Amino acid sequence: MQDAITAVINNYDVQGKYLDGAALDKLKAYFTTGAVRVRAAAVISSNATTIIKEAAAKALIYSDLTRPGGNMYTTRRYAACIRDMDYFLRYATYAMLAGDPSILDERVLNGLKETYNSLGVPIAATVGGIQAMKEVVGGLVGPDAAKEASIYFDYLSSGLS
Amino acid sequence: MQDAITAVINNYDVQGKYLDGAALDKLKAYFTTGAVRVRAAAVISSNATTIIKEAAAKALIYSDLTRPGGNMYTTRRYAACIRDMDYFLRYATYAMLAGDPSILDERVLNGLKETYNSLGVPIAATVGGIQAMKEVVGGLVGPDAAKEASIYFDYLSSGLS
Amino acid sequence: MQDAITAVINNYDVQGKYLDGAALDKLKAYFTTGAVRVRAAAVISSNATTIIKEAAAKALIYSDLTRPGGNMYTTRRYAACIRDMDYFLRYATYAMLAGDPSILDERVLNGLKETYNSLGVPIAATVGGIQAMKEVVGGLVGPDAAKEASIYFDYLSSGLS
Amino acid sequence: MQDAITAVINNYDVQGKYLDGAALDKLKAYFTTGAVRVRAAAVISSNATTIIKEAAAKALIYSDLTRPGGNMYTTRRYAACIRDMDYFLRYATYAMLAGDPSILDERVLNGLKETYNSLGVPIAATVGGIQAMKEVVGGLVGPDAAKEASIYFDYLSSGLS
Amino acid sequence: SRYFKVTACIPSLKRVRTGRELQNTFFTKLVPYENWFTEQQRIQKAGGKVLSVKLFTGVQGANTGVGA
Amino acid sequence: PPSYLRLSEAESKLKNNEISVREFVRRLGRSENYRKRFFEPYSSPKVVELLTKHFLGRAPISQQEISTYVQILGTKGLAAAVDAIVESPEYLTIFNEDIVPYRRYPTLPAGNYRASVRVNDEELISQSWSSLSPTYTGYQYVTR
Amino acid sequence: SVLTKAIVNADAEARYLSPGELDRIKSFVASGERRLRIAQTLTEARERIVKQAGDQLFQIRPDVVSPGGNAYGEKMTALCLRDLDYYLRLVTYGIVAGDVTPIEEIGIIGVKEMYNSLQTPIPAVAEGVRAMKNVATSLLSGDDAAEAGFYFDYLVGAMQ
Amino acid sequence: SVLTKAIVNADAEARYLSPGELDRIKSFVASGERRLRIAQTLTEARERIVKQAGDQLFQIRPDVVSPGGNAYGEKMTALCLRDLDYYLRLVTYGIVAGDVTPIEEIGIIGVKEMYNSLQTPIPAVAEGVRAMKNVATSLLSGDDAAEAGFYFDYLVGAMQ
Amino acid sequence: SVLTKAIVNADAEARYLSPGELDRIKSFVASGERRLRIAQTLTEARERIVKQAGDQLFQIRPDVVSPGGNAYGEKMTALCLRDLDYYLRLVTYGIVAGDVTPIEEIGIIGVKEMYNSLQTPIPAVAEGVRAMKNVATSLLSGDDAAEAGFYFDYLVGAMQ
Amino acid sequence: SVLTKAIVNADAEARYLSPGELDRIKSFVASGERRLRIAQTLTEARERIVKQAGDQLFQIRPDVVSPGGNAYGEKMTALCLRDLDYYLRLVTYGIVAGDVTPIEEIGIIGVKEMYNSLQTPIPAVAEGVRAMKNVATSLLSGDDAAEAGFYFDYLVGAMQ
Amino acid sequence: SVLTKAIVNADAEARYLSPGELDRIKSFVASGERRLRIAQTLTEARERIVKQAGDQLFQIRPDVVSPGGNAYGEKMTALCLRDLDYYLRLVTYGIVAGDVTPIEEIGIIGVKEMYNSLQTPIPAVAEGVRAMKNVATSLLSGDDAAEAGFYFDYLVGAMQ
Numbered sequence A, B, C, D: 001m002q003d004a005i006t007a008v009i010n011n012y013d014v015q016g017k018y019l020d021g022a023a024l025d026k027l028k029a030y031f032t033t034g035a036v037r038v039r040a041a042a043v044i045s046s047n048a049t050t051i052i053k054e055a056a057a058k059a060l061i062y063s064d065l066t067r068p069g070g071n072m073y074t075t076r077r078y079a080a081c082i083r084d085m086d087y088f089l090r091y092a093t094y095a096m097l098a099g100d101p102s103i104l105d106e107r108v109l110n111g112l113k114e115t116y117n118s119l120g121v122p123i124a125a126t127v128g129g130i131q132a133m134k135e136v137v138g139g140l141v142g143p144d145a146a147k148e149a150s151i152y153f154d155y156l157s158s159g160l161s
Numbered sequence E: 001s002r003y004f005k006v007t008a009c010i011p012s013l014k015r016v017r018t019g020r021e022l023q024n025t026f027f028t029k030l031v032p033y034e035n036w037f038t039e040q041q042r043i044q045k046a047g048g049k050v051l052s053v054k055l056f057t058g059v060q061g062a063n064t065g066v067g068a
Numbered sequence F: 001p002p003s004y005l006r007l008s009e010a011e012s013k014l015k016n017n018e019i020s021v022r023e024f025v026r027r028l029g030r031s032e033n034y035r036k037r038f039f040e041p042y043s044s045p046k047v048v049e050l051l052t053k054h055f056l057g058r059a060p061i062s063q064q065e066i067s068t069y070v071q072i073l074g075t076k077g078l079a080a081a082v083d084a085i086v087e088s089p090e091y092l093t094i095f096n097e098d099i100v101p102y103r104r105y106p107t108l109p110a111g112n113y114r115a116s117v118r119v120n121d122e123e124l125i126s127q128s129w130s131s132l133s134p135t136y137t138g139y140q141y142v143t144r
Numbered sequence G, H, I, J, K: 001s002v003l004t005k006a007i008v009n010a011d012a013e014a015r016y017l018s019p020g021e022l023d024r025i026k027s028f029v030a031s032g033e034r035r036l037r038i039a040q041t042l043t044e045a046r047e048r049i050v051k052q053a054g055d056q057l058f059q060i061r062p063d064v065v066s067p068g069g070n071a072y073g074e075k076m077t078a079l080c081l082r083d084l085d086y087y088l089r090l091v092t093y094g095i096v097a098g099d100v101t102p103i104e105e106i107g108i109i110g111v112k113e114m115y116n117s118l119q120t121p122i123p124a125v126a127e128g129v130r131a132m133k134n135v136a137t138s139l140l141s142g143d144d145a146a147e148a149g150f151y152f153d154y155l156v157g158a159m160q
């Protein structure tokens, strides 16, 4: 995986080039938006389980999924789905702090689509839950970091879909 | 693994339905044949080695398989063949006791065909050996469990072929 | 471990003896009280957390142990102690069911005194908690198995002391 | 392990007391000594091999230890002994950074005396090498952190002896 | 149902490992009866020293309720 | 584990140093809570590779290993197989008594690198252990 | 079920079934018609059992149906009643199966995360389960009542 | 014993006993006096059973009492008869216990090394055990005969 | 603390402290006096903060001071106030240490079993912690208030 | 960078970022402009630092430019100067990134096998790096000089 | 087949075979053994391929097994699986023949009228064939996998 700074450093090391004005501009661009990211991450960590609760109630629950015959039926499958939601929110927080989707591409999206296809998981329901937690985090974080937080949730939803 | 009772409970839990007359009929149908299954399983357990060597003498040995160029030649490969044969006998006993080929599909047949193709094991020869074991088990157990024993041997043979 | 039946079988197998009238009488004596043991174990299992609560409230909490400088102090130490009393209750139930303190000696008492001495655990407080749990168990189970429950709790208290 | 801050915090948590001026002065002293420890740490990290190559010269090599019949005889024993110097230097650096010999007692000193007795390692020779390293470190670091660095090497020497 | 309480000092004499290895070299640990033979002679094939072994759990008479 | 399986008395024996990390790993390997989750809903060349991945961090080396571990599973059951992996020299040198096992991706067995890359961190666990209620895969939508 | 448990243990140890397992299988198959009778009785009395258990739970714990309660509202109460019906069906499944594998893999594993995410009182649900236990044992003979009460007590203990 | 097996499984899973385990314990304690009666009958008829088992075994396999046979000679035959009496005592122990734990601990595991080291025919010992089972079931009622024959067949399969 | 965490991470790889893990130590020692001043300021107003937080918590959730409430009674409420004082002390410890590390070993791990065994509302305790957070942030400058609120929010999340 | 080292441990233990980690990220991000200005001067003085460093290296040990030396010849000396320029670039990378992840992954891991296969004196390379440290420190302000000296010191320590 | 097409295009010009077409013939005969081996390998695993591909198809396109679906119902699904088996047999025929002449005449031309008359989704049949391609290529070597995938791609494009 890589963050923005290490990504620029690697992108220049591959060319064998010293850090010039454009690269330092990218680095300063990441440096300026530092505060909103850590504050959004702290509020998300503090409100993680509440976020999962509203996201479930808003996108998945009170439907045919929770009823018998659905994928979310039984406490085992419900615990699996809520653990997956907590996982997704945690790695979205990681990607938001790192300013890069490489960690999501590596440790999350790799093989998930085929495995969910094999297990019968609803991809549309997963995307809806991801968007619900995106909405709740956008509400919680405030205007400082809502957009940056939303971009990586959109990345996860787009990669799954 | 699922037995007959677990299969019925599964087919009703998926629909979220209480047990009705049809489910009770299936359960009672399994219940009325319980004791014969126990007796036949005990007989097979007591005569496992006898059925194995009889099936080997009837289907495998005294042929090119036990000669140079055969698959079962050398003590190591013969041991592998008879160990597989004992696997077939014991898992057929398990399936007959449970009243379901779920164990046979789960812990036996999955990937066995590709494994035998990779190692070069003769599928037709092992099917014939399983058939010889089926005939010996049917002779030993008696009319009470002959057909119920033979159905899972046929299931194993159809899985291999 | 050993139960009453296994202990008698061991005591006769060491001498190479067939079972005689005295061994049969001991076996009959154990058999005559099996059901009361089962009901007492069921009641204890159904009320395990309640027994631990009242034992803790009567013997441990509201004291210097739960204050700073006490062994009970901090949630980590307190929960470790309560997991200990849960162990005591479950293994006392096992001893009652098996009719033998062999399992208590094998899996609980062996090394526990030295472990508590090294860790600073109050053995007197543990004895008091075990006795309170025994009192609660005797109250819950009734006259039928009160002494049977109390003997193994006293065994645990004597082994610790 | 525990540093000065964690030790003070634990010593107040055991009494359940809010921090006062007495602990505040102790914390402020470490906060004053913060910069010199970090500045001295990088010097030792850069001069680790050079520091080891002189203490060995002034304490161990050119003697019966490196000759036949010596404990440091043979390449394996020499490499293991110099790895022991590296262990001592790194953990002394950690101790001087954390302001406490807790890690030294935790991860170095426990079992070391008995292990060296079992393996035949000369404790006096090890103490002499540690003292030579202390001399070299005190020479390199300067007046600012010389005594602070030296106290932990003295602690290690006293613990081994 | 039997656990030995054993203590050994195994010296590494082939690689000179560069990280820690104190607990790996000197340790006291409980080992079940079914694996204590293999553990002991694995120690002996590593040039180890079996300082002490204890029976700890089981009874010394045995022959019933032992091979569980 | 969400206040789940864990190991009662095993955490205490680890923390008091009565038991070693390798001993705790062997205890976790042989239990109902491992057998039900990694031995029941699987055929029997594949339980061997799942066990070797969990305890060694790699795929099985060659075809000859699906003689040894296969026969161990067939004759002496799951416990003897889990003990053979733990007492194997490959486990002992790489991990030994007191380090938690991890993903490795070895290089030397000539193909074990790509096999290990595929078996772990390229393919996850399908085939949920319980056979009590399958998903009927007809409701992919949560519209309302 | 008992058959599944015994066969799974035998396969794990790589051996044929023990005589004790055979005897327990024989006893279970012998008690099958009695178990089916208990199951049909509870199934026919499913509504009244759930209703009486709900009333008993509401008398014992009015706070749950209070403004600061998880089940505050008519439809929140309906969801709780549906959960009680679900657990009654699970208990019937366990009684017919002869062991606790269906109840375990359907409605107890992960139920802590269930009612932690939904903020539902687990001891309150256990109290409701005890209420259904009382109502069900009121409609059964003593031996069958004890047989059902064992599984009800298992559910109560597991929900803790 | 059944109690030992149930307690071992409960302790291994770190839980109280399951309803199935409780039911099997109840069934075993119910069948205890019948098991005691069967064991008493076998112990009382211990000598005739051993003698007849030895006689049928010798008739089936005269080679064992032939010059190159393991049991050739009077005292070698007496040793085989003592082994049969030992197995009778183990069978009675297993019948009274309700399972095969003491039997396996005393006389099965290691028995392959027994008769390989002594060069004794394990199939011949199994055949002697089978004739022994026939003699034992000749002196019992049908249900008790089946109960004893389950342990006898367990021993026969163990020597396999 | 931050020093303990950095030293643990460096020792886990068997290396020396990298330049990256020395700037964190320098920043920690730079902010040390500010953290000490914040903790001492919170320590001066421990009684007022505890009392106001208890009042706010009781206004939000009067059910705990209701007959079916865990903190019903004068002494039960005094115990709740003492717990709030304990957690304020832990927050001060975390703020001075710079890392939250001691708070875990003191009062967050095992606290779920703590409050489940005492039957105390963990969400109510979280609400009380939020109340003391508001009281503390009412008595501090902006950056100091934010710094304390980080640890308060961490404790609230740990009580989840 | 600091981001990778502060995210890898969080991923390893499976949690969201701790406040000490967040505030060390604050110190890192606040020092961003000064880090960029520090790295710019070293790039301005790229081809002039290496010429001074080479002279001090060859004056300290001329044997590498001797006929038996590894750097004998015009093109051999040019290659060594190119390697010194490589390490200066890597030091600038570490300075801007705030940690040693790029430096480690590009030019230290396996460098021992590198210079052993090439038979180049690693201790000579260390003095060559230290010469670059001195020449770089000569052209920077005191705080910035110490800041760059930290990364030069890390490279010197890792090289041997 | 390649023989058929070469002979037909030669007879179109009414002349004897050119040497290039002869080199075609030698290449085709040399590859024929490998082609027949690949076809036999696919033939041995025909049931697993169709089963897994049908599961994959129902996963991707659930509307066909929806109430407004052509293959709604168990017999309608069985007919879909029989069609998939038909296409697998045709692909094996194409692989053995080398040229795609039999497949076009048997199951390609007129398939538009096929599924228009039956009201079946041709894109759904394409998805099923693609899943069949994936499962079949999972069981073959890379060169053989590409050789089969070419014919599978012909089926997917020619049902367009």
Ligand SMILES: *C[C@@H](*)[C@H]1/C(=C/c2[nH]c(/C=C3N=C(/C=C4\NC(=O)C(CC)=C4C)C(C)=C\3CCC(=O)O)c(CCC(=O)O)c2C)NC(=O)[C@@H]1C
Pocket (backbone or CB within 6 Å): A060, A065, A071, A072, A076, A077, A078, A080, A081, A082, A084, A085, A087, A107, A108, A109, A112, A115, A119, A121, A122, A125, A126, A129, F124, F125, F126, F127, F128
């Ligand atoms: C909102 C939740 C949806 C849902 C999910 C669901 N998932 C599973 C099972 C698994 N999920 C995973 C996931 C991962 N493995 C990884 O390595 C990563 C990234 C690091 C992920 C995200 C895996 C491997 C499984 C299978 C094993 C396991 O259960 O742990 C299940 C259970 C399905 C089953 O029982 O077979 C569910 C229900 N289901 C929905 O309906 C939601 C939309």
Ligand SMILES: *C[C@@H](*)[C@H]1/C(=C/c2[nH]c(/C=C3N=C(/C=C4\NC(=O)C(CC)=C4C)C(C)=C\3CCC(=O)O)c(CCC(=O)O)c2C)NC(=O)[C@@H]1C
Pocket (backbone or CB within 6 Å): B060, B065, B071, B072, B077, B078, B080, B081, B082, B084, B085, B087, B107, B108, B112, B115, B119, B121, B122, B123, B125, B126, B129, F043, F044, F045, F063, F065, F066, F067, F068, F070, F071, F073, F074
């Ligand atoms: C009658 C015997 C026939 C025969 C068989 C044969 N099989 C193998 C190798 C294996 N067979 C198995 C099967 C299983 N192992 C298990 O553990 C299970 C259940 C979990 C089964 C069903 C496996 C996995 C192998 C590979 C590993 C092993 O050898 O144990 C062999 C050996 C092939 C070789 O030499 O490489 C043979 C010979 N051979 C015949 O001639 C008969 C028809």
Ligand SMILES: *C[C@@H](*)[C@H]1/C(=C/c2[nH]c(/C=C3N=C(/C=C4\NC(=O)C(CC)=C4C)C(C)=C\3CCC(=O)O)c(CCC(=O)O)c2C)NC(=O)[C@@H]1C
Pocket (backbone or CB within 6 Å): C061, C062, C063, C066, C067, C073, C074, C075, I057, I064, I065, I069, I070, I071, I072, I076, I077, I079, I080, I081, I083, I084, I086, I087, I106, I107, I118, I120, I121, I122, I124, I125, I128
């Ligand atoms: C806001 C108050 C909430 C509440 C609390 C409550 N607590 C108790 C009893 C105890 N609380 C503790 C707490 C701790 N021990 C520790 O080591 C720490 C970490 C520093 C803490 C916080 C303990 C040990 C007890 C037991 C009694 C004792 O201290 O001796 C009680 C009383 C319960 C009872 O049954 O008497 C209450 C009510 N109750 C609420 O409603 C609030 C949410």
Ligand SMILES: *C[C@@H](*)[C@H]1/C(=C/c2[nH]c(/C=C3N=C(/C=C4\NC(=O)C(CC)=C4C)C(C)=C\3CCC(=O)O)c(CCC(=O)O)c2C)NC(=O)[C@@H]1C
Pocket (backbone or CB within 6 Å): K057, K064, K065, K069, K070, K071, K072, K076, K077, K079, K080, K081, K083, K084, K086, K087, K106, K107, K118, K120, K121, K124, K125, K128
């Ligand atoms: C993946 C399955 C898809 C699907 C198929 C579907 N097919 C039918 C019915 C028929 N299909 C055929 C096909 C063929 N005849 C040929 O000669 C060949 C070439 C080898 C083919 C492919 C025929 C003849 C029928 C009619 C019945 C018969 O075979 O006698 C149906 C049933 C339609 C009905 O009205 O009953 C279905 C559903 N449906 C899907 O949704 C899938 C995409």
Ligand SMILES: *[C@H](C)[C@H]1/C(=C/c2[nH]c(/C=C3N=C(/C=C4\NC(=O)C(CC)=C4C)C(C)=C\3CCC(=O)O)c(CCC(=O)O)c2C)NC(=O)[C@@H]1C
Pocket (backbone or CB within 6 Å): A061, A062, A063, A066, A067, A072, A073, A074, A075, G057, G064, G065, G069, G070, G071, G072, G076, G077, G079, G080, G081, G083, G084, G086, G087, G106, G107, G114, G118, G120, G121, G122, G124, G125, G128
């Ligand atoms: C009733 C005595 C208690 C109570 C319960 C309560 N439950 C919900 C909501 C749900 N409960 C479930 C339960 C299950 N799903 C399963 O698969 C199983 C196993 C068979 C169970 C038990 C589910 C899925 C939901 C969510 C809704 C849905 O089913 O789609 C609520 C509503 C919560 C809300 O926020 O609306 C309540 C109130 N409440 C009490 O007071 C009692 C302690």
Ligand SMILES: *[C@H](C)[C@H]1/C(=C/c2[nH]c(/C=C3N=C(/C=C4\NC(=O)C(CC)=C4C)C(C)=C\3CCC(=O)O)c(CCC(=O)O)c2C)NC(=O)[C@@H]1C
Pocket (backbone or CB within 6 Å): D061, D062, D063, D066, D067, D072, D073, D074, D075
């Ligand atoms: C000689 C061809 C090369 C060379 C060698 C050199 N060696 C030393 C010092 C020591 N060498 C050893 C060696 C061993 N100890 C053992 O047990 C074994 C295995 C049998 C060996 C090979 C030791 C122990 C020392 C240290 C002194 C001592 O023996 O007590 C030096 C001196 C280095 C110094 O800094 O003084 C030298 C120079 N030098 C060359 O140039 C040759 C290529």
Ligand SMILES: *[C@H](C)[C@H]1/C(=C/c2[nH]c(/C=C3N=C(/C=C4\NC(=O)C(CC)=C4C)C(C)=C\3CCC(=O)O)c(CCC(=O)O)c2C)NC(=O)[C@@H]1C
Pocket (backbone or CB within 6 Å): D060, D065, D070, D071, D072, D073, D076, D077, D078, D080, D081, D082, D084, D085, D087, D107, D108, D112, D115, D119, D121, D122, D123, D125, D126, D129, E011, E012, E013, E016, E017, E019, E020, E021, E022, E023, E025
């Ligand atoms: C060096 C001046 C002296 C000397 C040392 C010597 N040590 C060993 C072997 C070991 N030393 C250690 C040490 C540690 N492991 C740890 O984890 C720590 C703290 C973190 C320490 C200090 C251990 C465990 C061993 C044994 C395992 C191993 O070899 O790595 C040897 C080798 C002994 C042998 O050949 O068996 C030697 C020679 N010897 C001297 O003569 C010096 C006085």
Ligand SMILES: *[C@H](C)[C@H]1/C(=C/c2[nH]c(/C=C3N=C(/C=C4\NC(=O)C(CC)=C4C)C(C)=C\3CCC(=O)O)c(CCC(=O)O)c2C)NC(=O)[C@@H]1C
Pocket (backbone or CB within 6 Å): C065, C070, C071, C072, C073, C076, C077, C078, C080, C081, C082, C083, C084, C085, C087, C088, C107, C108, C112, C115, C119, C121, C122, C125, C126, C129, F009, F011, F012, F013, F015, F016
């Ligand atoms: C409880 C009534 C008292 C108490 C106890 C206490 N114990 C520990 C730690 C341990 N307790 C054990 C216990 C056992 N060893 C065994 O073999 C068994 C059977 C399963 C038991 C019950 C052990 C091994 C430990 C050490 C490992 C661990 O902590 O799990 C503590 C924690 C001490 C610490 O913080 O290090 C405590 C507090 N304390 C009291 O005040 C009670 C009177």
